[PDB]
Amino acid sequence: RYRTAFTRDQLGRLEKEFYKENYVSRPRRCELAAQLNLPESTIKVWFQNRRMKDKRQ
Amino acid sequence: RYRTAFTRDQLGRLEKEFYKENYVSRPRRCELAAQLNLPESTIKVWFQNRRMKDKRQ
DNA sequence: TAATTGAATT
DNA sequence: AATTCAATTA
């Protein structure tokens, strides 16, 4: 299926963004993507999964 | 964390099942678990790992 | 190498 | 939201 291994700078940035807001829109994810050098799709899915994780805990 | 230690006939039975089919459904797994006195989850995880082995080396 | 983690799928 | 399976970790 895949395997994106985020580096601590990417996951670290992602986690800072998640706690200010558990949801990010397409333009914003595009912004994070250019900045993070990752596909938009990758960021979308991470937020989806992070919301799920958060729900359980 | 962990660690389960298989008996020789438990693993031979596992390896036998695997050569016939690399995947067993949730209900066959319960049949094997009853028969081998091992946990349902243990067998699920073993097929997970054995497939990774087959797929990789 | 058994068990866990989490990225991707559906 | 529920599962799967590619990677670790111990």
Q: Please trace the helix and strand order of chain A, writing H or E for each element.
A: HHH
CATH-derived topology of chain A? Arc Repressor Mutant, subunit A
Oligomer: homodimer
| Count of spatially separate domains of chain A | 1
Overall spatial form of chain A: globular
CATH superfamily of chain A: Homeodomain-like
* CATH top-level class of chain A: Mainly Alpha
Number of strands of chain A: 0
- Supply the helix-strand structural class of chain A: mainly alpha
Note the total helix count of chain A: 3
User: Distance between termini of chain A?
Assistant: 27 Å
Proportion in β-strands of chain A: under 5%
**Main β sheet profile of chain A:** none
Named CATH architecture of chain A: Orthogonal Bundle
User: Helicity range of the residues of chain A?
Assistant: over 70%
Rg over C-alpha atoms of chain A, rounded to the nearest angstrom? 11 Å
PDB class: transcription/dna
Keywords: even-skipped, homeodomain
Assembly: tetrameric
Entry title: Even-skipped Homeodomain Complexed to AT-rich DNA
